Amino acid sequence: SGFRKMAFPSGKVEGCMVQVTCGTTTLNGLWLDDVVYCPRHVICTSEDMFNPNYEDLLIRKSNHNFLVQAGNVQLRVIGHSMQNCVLKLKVDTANPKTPKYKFVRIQPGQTFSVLACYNGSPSGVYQCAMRPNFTIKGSFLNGSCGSVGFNIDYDCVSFCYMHHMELPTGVHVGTDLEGNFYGPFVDRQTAQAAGTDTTITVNVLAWLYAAVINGDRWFLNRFTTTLNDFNLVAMKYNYEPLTQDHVDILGPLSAQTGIAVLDMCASLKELLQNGMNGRTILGSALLEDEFTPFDVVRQCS
Amino acid sequence: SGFRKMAFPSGKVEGCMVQVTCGTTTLNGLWLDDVVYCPRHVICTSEDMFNPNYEDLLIRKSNHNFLVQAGNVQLRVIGHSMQNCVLKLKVDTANPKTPKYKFVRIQPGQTFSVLACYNGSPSGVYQCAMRPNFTIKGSFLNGSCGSVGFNIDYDCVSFCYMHHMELPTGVHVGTDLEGNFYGPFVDRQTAQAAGTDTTITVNVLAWLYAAVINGDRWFLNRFTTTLNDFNLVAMKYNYEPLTQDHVDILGPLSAQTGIAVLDMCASLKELLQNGMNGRTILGSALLEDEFTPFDVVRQCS
Ligand SMILES: Cn1cc(-c2cc(-c3cc(Cl)c(F)c(OCc4ccccc4Cl)c3)c(=O)n(-c3cccnc3)c2)c(=O)[nH]c1=O
Ligand SMILES: Cn1cc(-c2cc(-c3cc(Cl)c(F)c(OCc4ccccc4Cl)c3)c(=O)n(-c3cccnc3)c2)c(=O)[nH]c1=O
């Protein structure tokens, strides 16, 4: 028993992390097969970041200007191209540690593991969720650019995130592995706001199911509600509206615990309108929304 | 910026995890050099767990009764011995993935990463702290026995924990890699209580420094206190007493932020006596005590 914010084992990804140096800038890249992926702003100088012309900047670089180092092994760059906000460096050697992998674009509300890296060397691993506003609340310092987020299914690594920037607000934004940003953001040092964020309702409900499974049940009450009635309360407290697709996804946890989804919604409604009154749930004094229904079943299975 | 509960990259340990089967019982073992370490209760049956005679039980087993499988590779067992509550299986092959490593016994209040495993296959990684009462609040299901906790310093893996049991209360207890339990616990299914637990004061203070570093400063006030005065409040709220050794360990964070340790104690005192009044600190509505001063500097560096 017990419930923790749990990351995937990072070994398969550690073997793909390399250091990419261009000019004076150094950050992390991802070496899969004979391609190295990294943020395209590796080609920028300090004065370039305000409105860089990445086409013009990339034109001034040659293969030999991109220094790729895998641990202590230097890689020979035989080609370079730009795809959206990602730079793709063709090297003459396939990564012998290349796991089975796919590139995927996750949806808001879904979770993944982040392997924080610096100078191509792994530093730590943690789980986080793609916020509804396409930001993530991570832990990133200068030099962390190029770190990636991922999920693992048995032996297949699904890469979903590459880190690019921290906004003035302290939140973190990035791209999928085809270089398309999550959210409205652009890789320029100019004003850009993240949308209003909201709480991931289906994840909060899944987390309440995980609490019940692990012995925390003081929040279960004698009430029930309707999808429409609960959504009235959701809107008031800036929660994502609950849909039937959400109810369906919660079906397994509902069956495992014998608590109807709408009954659990009545508990959440009561918590939103009255607080926890100094109590805690799974060691937290607030409602957690960074566990997906799949995460709960994984951990609780 | 940002602050997260961050685990070490688990790759170096994933390559050491194996499956150990004895009779009908299967759990995880740690393969380092030509030795496999696992909990000695792998030799028990259901009826044995109430008062097993491990010497008598081990006498009925032979080398060929211990099935060690590293992924798909079967290992040939050439020797077996018992050290405290740990079983040591000598195999005829050295683990080619053996990292640099040491065995260490951590102190209460210190943290480490747990690689949760099942059937010798890594499942997830998370950070937790050795509670003052020598328990840990983890996430462990049946079959997780033999999972290990560790820290990593550059390239050296310090193993500090092997998982053995979940108590009726839901907390988790285990041994160091020499088979000595943390705490008063014994590997028998008999009544055994964990001592009164307390909050790790020095970790709470380090966490408040991490908050200030990352922009959360609403809890800083115009007061100060003394070591003796604060300890009066610590005792009231079941906090570990603060010592000068603790103040010394907080010296770096004090210097980095310019906040005297005793000034920060005055903030903690105010939080203990008045609560957070609905506010939050680093995304938490309670005082976090599972970050060590070293963890804060690591992440914030
Ligand atoms: C040379 N150099 C630079 C970086 C590096 C670059 C960036 C970075 C990259 C680009 Cl294109 C930007 F438009 C940018 O302005 C963000 C911004 C500022 C002000 C107003 C609005 C906005 Cl949007 C920032 C970064 O944000 N970080 C970072 C730091 C801390 C946590 N996370 C990310 C790091 C690096 O890692 N390695 C390396 O060598
Ligand atoms: C056959 N078998 C058994 C286990 C296995 C054994 C145990 C386990 C081992 C020993 Cl020696 C015990 F005295 C024991 O009684 C704990 C207890 C019960 C009642 C009152 C007081 C006490 Cl103290 C339990 C276990 O606790 N867990 C576990 C489960 C969930 C989370 N964490 C740990 C698992 C295994 O993993 N694999 C495998 O094959």
XYZ file of C-alpha atoms and ligand atoms in Angstrom:
680
model
C 0.000 0.000 0.000
C 0.890 3.689 0.002
C 0.737 6.259 -2.782
C 3.614 8.345 -4.118
C 4.364 10.579 -7.092
C 6.335 7.964 -8.998
C 8.540 8.384 -12.064
C 9.404 5.775 -14.658
C 12.832 4.130 -14.391
C 15.115 6.445 -16.343
C 17.838 4.022 -17.454
C 16.610 3.656 -21.031
C 16.692 7.436 -21.478
C 19.974 8.062 -19.635
C 21.712 6.100 -22.393
C 20.388 8.549 -25.004
C 21.476 11.829 -23.400
C 24.357 13.732 -24.996
C 25.925 17.180 -24.772
C 25.565 19.555 -27.728
C 27.845 22.585 -28.045
C 27.532 25.286 -30.708
C 29.684 28.363 -30.395
C 29.660 29.139 -26.683
C 26.249 27.587 -25.928
C 26.011 24.081 -24.475
C 22.858 22.109 -23.701
C 21.430 18.598 -23.837
C 20.494 16.507 -26.846
C 18.733 13.193 -27.428
C 20.657 10.588 -29.449
C 18.356 8.027 -31.098
C 19.569 5.853 -33.972
C 21.916 8.193 -35.931
C 20.132 11.474 -35.107
C 20.666 13.918 -32.235
C 17.719 16.145 -31.277
C 18.123 19.392 -29.330
C 16.501 22.836 -29.034
C 17.305 25.027 -32.007
C 18.189 27.985 -29.780
C 21.528 26.239 -29.200
C 22.639 28.317 -32.215
C 21.793 31.638 -30.539
C 23.945 34.207 -28.773
C 22.817 36.395 -25.889
C 21.966 39.279 -28.231
C 20.085 36.902 -30.570
C 17.391 35.725 -28.139
C 15.132 38.779 -28.462
C 14.184 38.243 -32.125
C 16.443 35.600 -33.668
C 16.176 34.712 -37.346
C 16.813 30.995 -36.953
C 17.077 30.452 -40.712
C 19.810 33.094 -41.006
C 21.523 31.854 -37.841
C 21.511 28.220 -38.978
C 22.925 29.221 -42.372
C 26.111 30.503 -40.712
C 26.805 27.104 -39.093
C 28.434 24.036 -40.636
C 28.493 20.377 -39.627
C 31.838 20.810 -37.860
C 30.455 23.676 -35.742
C 28.148 21.264 -33.852
C 30.130 19.461 -31.137
C 28.238 16.357 -29.964
C 29.776 14.402 -27.078
C 28.289 11.152 -25.739
C 29.929 10.795 -22.353
C 33.596 10.856 -23.347
C 32.952 9.816 -26.974
C 32.902 12.515 -29.639
C 30.343 11.997 -32.409
C 31.029 12.984 -36.015
C 28.258 15.207 -37.403
C 27.498 14.514 -41.077
C 24.311 16.553 -41.456
C 22.085 19.153 -39.823
C 18.519 20.330 -40.347
C 15.815 22.286 -38.546
C 12.296 20.969 -37.915
C 10.070 23.573 -36.247
C 11.917 24.569 -33.030
C 14.105 21.438 -32.985
C 17.555 20.923 -34.495
C 18.328 17.487 -35.965
C 22.006 16.504 -36.248
C 22.840 13.475 -38.380
C 25.817 11.563 -36.967
C 27.800 8.754 -38.577
C 27.132 6.305 -35.714
C 23.893 4.793 -34.440
C 23.392 4.959 -30.692
C 24.060 1.369 -29.543
C 21.814 2.036 -26.521
C 18.819 3.178 -28.602
C 15.733 1.662 -26.946
C 12.472 0.972 -28.689
C 10.820 4.360 -28.911
C 8.147 6.532 -30.470
C 7.497 10.265 -30.634
C 4.078 11.266 -29.298
C 2.237 14.483 -28.513
C 0.500 14.182 -25.147
C -2.720 15.976 -24.250
C -3.277 18.442 -21.408
C -3.919 16.639 -18.143
C -1.616 13.720 -18.972
C 1.567 12.962 -17.042
C 5.124 11.966 -17.911
C 8.559 11.614 -16.344
C 11.240 14.290 -16.741
C 14.934 13.382 -16.702
C 16.640 16.645 -15.770
C 20.067 16.850 -17.418
C 22.997 19.266 -17.450
C 25.912 19.117 -19.890
C 24.309 15.929 -21.187
C 24.617 14.263 -17.771
C 21.448 13.076 -15.995
C 20.729 14.869 -12.713
C 17.375 13.572 -11.452
C 13.956 12.264 -12.405
C 10.470 13.403 -11.420
C 6.886 13.116 -12.633
C 4.784 16.070 -13.730
C 1.641 16.820 -15.708
C 1.003 18.915 -18.793
C -1.148 21.673 -17.314
C -4.368 22.644 -19.121
C -2.500 25.803 -20.181
C 0.311 23.729 -21.755
C 2.911 24.662 -19.140
C 4.602 22.353 -16.649
C 5.676 23.090 -13.078
C 9.075 21.418 -12.987
C 12.549 21.976 -11.559
C 14.889 23.377 -14.212
C 18.071 25.451 -13.948
C 20.125 27.146 -16.639
C 21.633 24.475 -18.864
C 18.648 22.140 -18.453
C 17.450 22.874 -22.000
C 17.153 19.683 -24.023
C 15.997 17.535 -21.123
C 13.108 15.325 -22.203
C 9.879 13.957 -20.786
C 8.699 10.455 -21.558
C 6.478 7.523 -20.711
C 7.436 3.844 -20.898
C 5.173 0.924 -21.875
C 7.036 -2.299 -21.070
C 10.037 -1.706 -23.343
C 8.822 1.175 -25.552
C 9.858 4.715 -24.608
C 7.351 7.344 -25.760
C 9.095 10.720 -25.809
C 6.629 13.577 -25.435
C 8.524 16.660 -24.226
C 11.767 18.552 -24.724
C 12.483 21.474 -22.413
C 13.091 24.872 -24.026
C 12.353 27.856 -21.767
C 11.385 29.154 -18.352
C 8.949 32.062 -18.505
C 9.294 35.141 -16.272
C 6.578 33.585 -14.100
C 8.797 30.580 -13.344
C 6.801 28.029 -15.349
C 8.382 25.785 -17.963
C 7.456 25.366 -21.627
C 8.718 23.144 -24.397
C 8.015 21.164 -27.531
C 7.242 17.674 -28.691
C 10.071 15.868 -30.457
C 9.000 17.315 -33.821
C 9.746 20.783 -32.427
C 6.136 21.970 -32.087
C 5.599 23.916 -28.876
C 2.924 22.926 -26.428
C 0.848 26.066 -26.016
C 1.149 29.467 -27.695
C 4.823 29.931 -26.856
C 7.699 30.830 -29.197
C 11.454 30.517 -28.659
C 12.060 34.273 -28.430
C 12.829 36.386 -25.357
C 9.701 38.494 -25.740
C 6.592 38.963 -23.627
C 4.287 35.947 -23.800
C 1.618 34.942 -21.301
C 0.344 31.484 -20.459
C -3.416 31.095 -20.574
C -5.545 30.847 -17.479
C -4.879 27.478 -15.880
C -7.473 25.148 -14.394
C -7.500 22.061 -12.189
C -7.636 18.633 -13.850
C -10.938 17.343 -12.473
C -10.641 13.737 -13.668
C -7.203 13.462 -12.037
C -8.504 14.814 -8.723
C -11.242 12.164 -8.795
C -8.770 9.399 -9.654
C -6.633 10.589 -6.733
C -9.613 10.360 -4.378
C -10.115 6.772 -5.550
C -6.444 6.095 -4.786
C -6.987 7.537 -1.308
C -9.951 5.231 -0.653
C -7.935 2.245 -1.886
C -5.134 3.070 0.569
C -7.341 3.639 3.632
C -8.197 7.361 3.502
C -11.999 7.468 3.438
C -13.058 10.271 5.815
C -14.188 12.335 2.800
C -16.825 9.812 1.701
C -20.283 11.165 2.536
C -23.970 10.252 2.257
C -24.627 12.478 -0.774
C -24.681 12.154 -4.539
C -24.871 14.584 -7.438
C -25.446 14.891 -11.174
C -22.947 15.595 -13.928
C -24.667 18.933 -14.563
C -24.888 19.886 -10.884
C -21.228 19.045 -10.252
C -20.163 21.058 -13.298
C -21.883 24.070 -11.733
C -19.511 23.690 -8.781
C -16.552 22.864 -11.032
C -16.948 26.163 -12.890
C -17.133 28.097 -9.615
C -13.804 26.689 -8.376
C -11.976 26.752 -11.742
C -12.111 23.000 -12.327
C -12.223 21.514 -15.799
C -15.782 20.419 -16.647
C -16.430 16.704 -16.220
C -17.625 14.819 -19.305
C -18.958 11.330 -19.949
C -15.600 10.388 -21.479
C -14.122 11.239 -18.074
C -16.723 9.106 -16.286
C -15.904 6.223 -18.630
C -12.161 6.500 -17.948
C -12.900 6.311 -14.212
C -14.935 3.118 -14.708
C -12.205 0.706 -13.588
C -11.482 2.582 -10.346
C -15.230 2.827 -9.752
C -15.537 -0.946 -10.162
C -12.492 -1.733 -8.010
C -13.770 0.327 -5.061
C -17.538 0.026 -5.469
C -17.952 3.818 -5.315
C -20.032 5.257 -8.147
C -18.325 8.089 -10.028
C -21.161 10.506 -9.271
C -21.009 9.555 -5.587
C -17.307 10.429 -5.587
C -18.156 13.688 -7.372
C -20.439 14.493 -4.432
C -17.449 14.037 -2.121
C -15.275 16.321 -4.255
C -18.070 18.903 -4.371
C -18.232 18.840 -0.570
C -14.450 19.259 -0.314
C -14.488 22.198 -2.742
C -17.284 23.986 -0.860
C -16.013 23.317 2.685
C -12.265 22.644 2.442
C -10.557 19.874 4.371
C -10.955 21.656 7.738
C -7.370 20.885 8.706
C -7.473 17.221 7.663
C -5.249 15.578 5.049
C -5.649 13.118 2.179
C -2.752 10.801 1.306
C -0.447 13.126 3.225
C -1.587 16.258 1.361
C -3.588 19.211 2.682
C -4.747 20.159 -0.835
C -6.471 18.375 -3.713
C -3.908 16.708 -5.988
C -4.511 16.818 -9.754
C -1.253 15.410 -11.183
C -2.236 11.710 -11.071
C -4.098 10.316 -14.066
C -6.555 7.418 -13.729
C -3.950 5.279 -15.503
C -1.258 6.338 -13.024
C -3.465 5.293 -10.094
C -4.139 1.850 -11.577
C -0.457 1.368 -12.434
C 0.734 2.203 -8.925
C -2.179 0.358 -7.279
C -1.506 -2.747 -9.415
C 13.740 27.648 -10.788
C 11.072 25.459 -9.208
C 11.348 22.785 -6.534
C 10.313 19.145 -6.836
C 10.769 15.893 -4.935
C 13.489 14.548 -7.203
C 14.941 11.040 -7.390
C 18.370 10.027 -8.615
C 18.599 8.585 -12.136
C 17.965 4.877 -11.651
C 19.841 3.419 -14.631
C 22.876 2.259 -12.662
C 20.629 0.306 -10.288
C 18.236 -1.070 -12.923
C 21.169 -3.051 -14.321
C 21.640 -4.780 -10.950
C 18.069 -5.964 -10.347
C 17.341 -9.684 -10.665
C 14.542 -12.093 -9.793
C 15.114 -14.646 -7.025
C 12.836 -17.679 -6.712
C 12.971 -20.229 -3.889
C 10.240 -22.818 -3.689
C 7.084 -20.910 -4.572
C 8.281 -17.488 -3.356
C 9.661 -14.946 -5.824
C 11.074 -11.506 -5.052
C 13.826 -9.112 -6.093
C 17.562 -9.384 -5.575
C 20.565 -7.119 -6.097
C 23.370 -8.505 -8.284
C 26.731 -6.840 -7.578
C 29.994 -8.445 -8.687
C 29.337 -12.210 -8.230
C 26.898 -11.927 -5.299
C 23.102 -11.618 -5.268
C 21.513 -10.016 -2.190
C 17.860 -10.520 -1.246
C 15.654 -10.733 1.864
C 16.127 -14.002 3.699
C 12.373 -14.536 4.027
C 12.465 -15.687 0.393
C 12.983 -19.140 1.959
C 9.723 -18.996 3.936
C 6.303 -20.495 3.298
C 3.006 -18.947 4.352
C 2.897 -21.020 7.548
C 6.540 -20.131 8.319
C 6.148 -16.350 8.633
C 4.774 -16.336 12.188
C 7.929 -17.663 13.888
C 10.352 -18.972 11.265
C 13.618 -20.616 12.275
C 15.717 -19.208 9.448
C 18.701 -21.407 10.317
C 16.578 -24.565 10.069
C 14.821 -23.287 6.944
C 18.081 -22.394 5.191
C 19.533 -25.815 6.034
C 16.848 -27.520 3.929
C 17.850 -25.552 0.801
C 20.687 -26.254 -1.628
C 22.425 -24.111 -4.236
C 20.204 -25.494 -7.004
C 17.045 -24.526 -5.081
C 17.793 -20.798 -5.583
C 16.680 -19.728 -9.072
C 18.320 -16.411 -10.021
C 17.277 -14.875 -13.348
C 18.817 -11.669 -14.733
C 16.321 -10.590 -17.358
C 16.248 -13.685 -19.561
C 19.656 -14.978 -18.394
C 19.740 -17.706 -15.759
C 22.573 -17.418 -13.233
C 24.332 -20.470 -11.801
C 24.378 -20.392 -7.988
C 27.608 -21.784 -6.513
C 27.144 -20.742 -2.885
C 24.679 -19.382 -0.345
C 24.976 -17.799 3.088
C 22.921 -15.739 5.520
C 24.069 -12.419 6.998
C 21.577 -11.040 9.528
C 18.247 -10.786 7.630
C 19.886 -10.884 4.181
C 20.612 -13.894 1.975
C 23.817 -13.816 -0.094
C 23.940 -16.043 -3.193
C 27.330 -16.578 -4.818
C 27.016 -16.915 -8.601
C 29.654 -18.006 -11.102
C 29.405 -14.783 -13.149
C 30.172 -11.184 -12.223
C 27.498 -8.670 -13.147
C 28.967 -6.884 -16.196
C 26.821 -3.845 -15.313
C 28.133 -3.566 -11.734
C 28.601 0.161 -11.060
C 30.960 1.612 -8.514
C 29.166 1.132 -5.227
C 29.347 1.064 -1.451
C 27.079 -0.205 1.310
C 26.142 2.471 3.848
C 23.786 2.796 6.798
C 21.946 6.116 6.613
C 20.748 8.052 9.647
C 17.178 9.070 10.476
C 16.203 12.238 8.651
C 18.297 11.445 5.568
C 16.796 10.784 2.142
C 17.369 8.293 -0.664
C 15.801 7.069 -3.892
C 13.739 3.871 -4.046
C 13.580 1.794 -7.230
C 10.375 -0.203 -6.828
C 10.718 -3.590 -8.534
C 8.522 -6.625 -9.154
C 9.769 -9.990 -10.418
C 13.163 -8.314 -10.714
C 11.797 -5.754 -13.189
C 11.973 -2.042 -12.302
C 8.577 -0.360 -11.923
C 9.230 3.216 -10.781
C 11.477 5.513 -8.786
C 10.711 7.964 -5.988
C 12.488 9.777 -3.167
C 11.699 9.263 0.502
C 13.232 9.871 3.912
C 14.139 7.549 6.757
C 11.662 8.697 9.396
C 12.940 9.366 12.931
C 11.187 6.110 13.889
C 13.138 4.164 11.226
C 10.127 3.578 8.976
C 9.574 4.927 5.473
C 6.323 6.027 3.839
C 6.702 4.510 0.387
C 4.612 2.784 -2.272
C 5.081 -0.988 -2.118
C 2.855 -3.869 -3.233
C 3.211 -7.598 -2.685
C 6.289 -8.798 -4.541
C 8.172 -5.533 -3.972
C 10.439 -7.170 -1.375
C 14.088 -6.808 -2.335
C 13.707 -3.363 -3.868
C 16.546 -1.111 -2.743
C 17.111 2.505 -1.791
C 20.259 4.347 -2.768
C 22.081 7.616 -3.261
C 24.501 8.443 -6.080
C 27.620 10.640 -5.864
C 28.846 11.256 -9.417
C 29.457 7.614 -10.358
C 29.329 5.868 -6.953
C 26.063 4.209 -5.913
C 25.614 4.076 -2.131
C 23.021 1.416 -1.328
C 21.326 2.072 2.001
C 18.007 0.191 2.059
C 16.432 -3.110 1.072
C 12.676 -3.466 1.466
C 11.409 -6.307 3.665
C 7.940 -5.740 5.149
C 4.833 -3.599 5.360
C 3.472 -3.301 8.891
C -0.260 -3.521 9.671
C -0.208 0.284 9.869
C 0.834 0.536 6.212
C 4.381 1.778 6.837
C 7.433 0.112 5.329
C 10.505 -1.281 7.084
C 13.718 -2.836 5.873
C 17.421 -3.389 6.338
C 20.754 -2.060 5.220
C 22.656 -4.248 2.776
C 24.287 -6.168 5.643
C 20.809 -7.329 6.680
C 20.493 -5.202 9.832
C 17.007 -3.753 10.200
C 16.474 -0.055 10.606
C 14.482 0.239 13.814
C 13.322 -2.436 16.257
C 11.673 -4.610 13.616
C 12.151 -8.340 12.973
C 11.224 -10.414 9.919
C 8.408 -12.304 11.657
C 4.645 -11.890 11.248
C 4.125 -10.919 14.876
C 2.933 -7.758 16.589
C 5.554 -5.008 16.481
C 4.992 -1.276 16.856
C 6.982 1.578 15.377
C 8.084 4.212 17.859
C 6.480 7.610 18.084
C 7.480 9.572 15.001
C 8.518 13.216 14.901
C 9.038 15.887 12.257
C 12.557 16.460 10.908
C 13.112 20.068 11.975
C 16.332 20.704 10.040
C 14.668 19.483 6.832
C 11.663 21.766 7.349
C 14.051 24.711 7.732
C 16.029 23.719 4.633
C 12.720 23.518 2.753
C 11.801 27.039 3.867
C 15.154 28.220 2.503
C 14.329 26.495 -0.793
C 10.994 28.326 -0.821
C 12.681 31.711 -0.339
C 15.164 30.898 -3.109
C 12.299 30.127 -5.508
C 10.184 33.208 -4.725
C 7.940 32.103 -1.836
C 8.677 34.582 0.953
C 5.312 35.513 2.513
C 6.290 33.577 5.663
C 9.303 35.783 6.428
C 8.493 38.033 9.389
C 10.050 40.745 11.564
C 10.835 38.411 14.481
C 13.739 36.328 15.709
C 14.199 33.670 18.368
C 16.763 31.685 20.335
C 17.742 28.045 19.995
C 16.289 27.385 23.453
C 13.077 29.330 22.828
C 12.458 27.604 19.491
C 13.051 24.192 21.061
C 10.255 24.992 23.515
C 7.935 25.327 20.515
C 9.496 22.338 18.746
C 8.672 20.069 21.689
C 5.078 21.325 21.776
C 4.477 20.430 18.111
C 6.458 17.151 18.088
C 9.430 18.508 16.148
C 12.923 17.142 16.613
C 14.980 19.505 18.797
C 17.311 21.798 16.873
C 21.014 21.566 17.726
C 24.093 23.582 16.817
C 25.140 20.806 14.429
C 21.849 21.485 12.637
C 22.540 25.230 12.548
C 25.984 24.514 11.099
C 24.559 22.281 8.354
C 22.181 25.101 7.391
C 25.096 27.551 7.105
C 25.376 27.422 3.306
C 21.663 28.071 2.725
C 21.830 30.848 5.317
C 24.726 32.434 3.423
C 23.115 32.012 -0.005
C 19.887 33.755 1.055
C 21.139 36.181 3.701
C 18.557 34.918 6.213
C 20.017 34.001 9.596
C 19.101 30.502 10.774
C 17.504 31.827 13.960
C 15.497 34.344 11.927
C 14.162 31.471 9.820
C 13.405 29.568 13.035
C 11.232 32.524 14.058
C 9.295 32.091 10.810
C 8.834 28.361 11.421
C 7.739 29.063 14.999
C 5.113 31.480 13.677
C 3.888 28.903 11.147
C 3.639 26.206 13.830
C 1.659 28.449 16.197
C -0.665 30.007 13.589
C -0.793 27.624 10.612
C -0.640 28.824 7.026
C -4.154 30.344 7.140
C -5.043 28.839 3.774
C -1.811 29.862 2.033
C 0.706 27.503 0.428
C 4.484 27.111 0.294
C 6.084 25.632 -2.834
C 2.688 24.228 -3.783
C 2.132 22.528 -0.409
C -0.395 23.397 2.299
C 1.698 21.661 4.984
C 5.293 21.865 6.197
C 7.517 19.492 4.213
C 10.241 17.592 6.093
C 11.549 15.144 3.459
C 14.162 17.468 1.897
C 17.605 17.528 3.485
C 19.814 20.636 3.369
C 21.993 18.737 0.888
C 18.975 17.953 -1.301
C 18.042 21.648 -1.438
C 21.552 22.697 -2.479
C 21.745 19.908 -5.069
C 18.449 20.850 -6.705
C 19.110 24.596 -6.348
C 22.585 24.199 -7.902
C 22.936 29.788 -23.655
N 22.117 28.795 -22.976
C 20.869 29.106 -22.617
C 20.051 28.183 -21.963
C 18.619 28.590 -21.578
C 17.868 29.393 -22.430
C 16.570 29.739 -22.073
C 15.750 30.625 -23.011
C 15.690 30.335 -24.378
C 14.940 31.145 -25.226
Cl 14.830 30.841 -26.980
C 14.254 32.233 -24.715
F 13.531 32.998 -25.579
C 14.308 32.512 -23.353
O 13.632 33.612 -22.821
C 12.591 33.330 -21.923
C 11.912 34.670 -21.641
C 12.644 35.638 -20.971
C 12.070 36.871 -20.705
C 10.766 37.138 -21.105
C 10.036 36.172 -21.777
C 10.607 34.938 -22.049
Cl 9.635 33.718 -22.915
C 15.062 31.713 -22.505
C 16.021 29.297 -20.870
O 14.875 29.604 -20.545
N 16.776 28.525 -20.075
C 16.267 28.016 -18.811
C 16.766 28.439 -17.591
C 16.218 27.899 -16.430
C 15.199 26.961 -16.526
N 14.740 26.570 -17.714
C 15.248 27.072 -18.840
C 18.020 28.177 -20.401
C 20.598 26.925 -21.701
O 19.964 26.039 -21.127
N 21.853 26.669 -22.084
C 22.607 27.583 -22.710
O 23.712 27.300 -23.024
C 5.849 -14.840 -0.518
N 6.201 -13.453 -0.781
C 5.987 -12.530 0.160
C 6.309 -11.189 -0.053
C 6.050 -10.168 1.067
C 6.265 -10.518 2.396
C 6.039 -9.578 3.395
C 6.274 -9.970 4.853
C 7.452 -10.624 5.225
C 7.660 -10.976 6.556
Cl 9.133 -11.824 7.097
C 6.702 -10.676 7.508
F 6.945 -11.036 8.798
C 5.534 -10.015 7.136
O 4.551 -9.715 8.080
C 4.312 -8.352 8.320
C 3.345 -8.303 9.503
C 2.070 -8.812 9.317
C 1.165 -8.797 10.367
C 1.531 -8.273 11.601
C 2.807 -7.767 11.787
C 3.718 -7.783 10.741
Cl 5.351 -7.122 11.019
C 5.319 -9.671 5.810
C 5.593 -8.296 3.077
O 5.386 -7.460 3.956
N 5.396 -7.995 1.785
C 4.944 -6.675 1.377
C 3.691 -6.461 0.827
C 3.341 -5.164 0.466
C 4.246 -4.129 0.662
N 5.447 -4.364 1.190
C 5.806 -5.598 1.545
C 5.613 -8.879 0.812
C 6.861 -10.858 -1.292
O 7.178 -9.705 -1.584
N 7.054 -11.824 -2.197
C 6.730 -13.101 -1.954
O 6.922 -13.913 -2.794
